[PDB]
Copies of this chain bind each other. A is one copy, B any other.
């Protein structure tokens, strides 16, 4: 049912990079309602709602999970619980290596899967093509340079 959503599994200590990533996803043309990002007031959890039950519903109905791996991802319990919850159900997933992560991919995640980096223009081009293939969208060159500049200046 919810296969079209994008559950961005992350840590709260990676706020800025994940914010920039979500903003780029919006810029390419992803509807702002399809990103279940629980660290932004505009995609977070509705008020007067159960947090964990709200997450469980989305994970159970099937959501494209995004592991934004980093050191803090493996230092937080809830992130590993989410990894297990998406492993057992066999939800569509994808790994994203945040800058500065030189560690080992532990846990029950598929360790023999190629991860997406976010460090050089070719990486961003590959990610853009991935998203456009996923949601069947279209983007033009001038816009792509503008978005790339925005993302790069956000990280800096």
Known: A50-B113, A80-B80. A122 touches B145 (CB 8 A): yes
Chain A interface, DSSP helix/strand/loop, else mixed: helix
Within 8 A of B (CB), among A46-63: 46-53, 56, 59-60
- In-complex Cβ contact of A123 among B41, B49, B51 (8 A): B41
Mark interface residues in A76-100 (1 if CB within 8 Å of B CB, else 0). Answer: 0110111111011100001000000
Complex formed: what's the CA distance from A148 to B45 in Å?
Answer: 21
Copy number of this protein in the oligomer? 10
User: In the complex, which residues of chain B have a beta carbon less than 8 angstroms from the beta carbon of A110?
Assistant: 50
Complex formed: what's the CA distance from A117 to B106 in Å?
Answer: 25
Count of interface residues, chain A, beta-carbon cutoff 8 Å: 51
Residue A138 at the B interface, CB < 8 A? no
User: In the complex, which residues of chain B have a beta carbon less than 8 angstroms from the beta carbon of A125?
Assistant: 141-142, 145
Complex formed: what's the CA distance from A130 to B92 in Å?
Answer: 35
A interface residue numbers (CB < 8 A to B): 41-42, 44-53, 56, 59-60, 74, 77-78, 80-85, 87-89, 94, 106-108, 110, 112-117, 120-123, 125-126, 130, 141-142, 145-146, 148-149
11 A–B pairs (Cβ distance < 8 Å), ordered by A: A41-B122, A50-B110, A50-B113, A53-B112, A56-B88, A81-B107, A85-B87, A122-B142, A122-B145, A125-B142, A141-B141
